[PDB]
Design a protein around this nucleic acid. Structure first.
Length: 164
DNA sequence: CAAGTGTGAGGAAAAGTAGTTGGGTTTTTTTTGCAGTTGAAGACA
């Protein structure tokens, strides 16, 4: 039950939390060592950097259900391990991601952290429409300045194989 | 043929809050024994 800046801070925090839970199932499923884990961290460390700057009372951040996978997608692309469609289908099919419902957290309490123009909107609101999927991957790249930072973006001779 | 600024709204969701009701205490301001006695109507010198 918190409104305003600090409501945002833990909405921030919770967002922080689930992405991390997302990443570790990431490792278990793909077993792609420290590497997958740490690149993902700093990626959001980088994402956080900008959020603090336009703070004051900037509440444009609260990321969408999609921002998290865009983040993991961007980081993977760095690592260039896989593909998007395959990743998305696999994730939905096995609920590999905690993406769908936001009750996990470790919140019990973050849940009650009331919603404050936030936390309630997190975890499992809806399924992606059209580009919409990327309509934010691009934004994240925008926030990130990702292309300069990370090598070989979107590539994969593996998507071609997957496709044939 | 084609690419590019400016921008209004549509939509979602948990909890609150509405309407309609009821419950709910609350809260509350037929003589059966006795003995005596008074007053009565009636009566009298």
């Amino acid at each position: 039950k918190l409104i305003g800046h600090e409501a945002k801070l833990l909405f921030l925090k919770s967002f922080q939390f689930i992405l991390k839970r997302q990443i570790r199932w990431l490792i278990t499923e793909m077993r792609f060592p420290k590497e997958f884990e740490h690149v993902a961290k700093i990626i959001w460390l980088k994402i956080l950097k900008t959020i603090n700057d336009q703070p004051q009372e900037e509440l444009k951040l609260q990321l969408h259900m999609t921002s998290t996978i865009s983040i993991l997608y961007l980081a993977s692309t760095h690592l260039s391990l896989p593909v998007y469609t395959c990743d998305y289908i696999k994730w939905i099919c096995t609920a590999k991601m905690p993406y769908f419902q936001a009750s996990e957290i470790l919140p019990k309490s973050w849940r009650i952290q009331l919603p404050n123009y936030y936390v309630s909107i997190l975890e499992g609101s809806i399924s992606p429409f059209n580009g919409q999927l990327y309509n934010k991957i691009a934004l994240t790249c925008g926030m990130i300045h990702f292309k300069e930072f990370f090598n070989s973006e979107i590539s994969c001779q593996g998507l071609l194989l997957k496709l044939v």
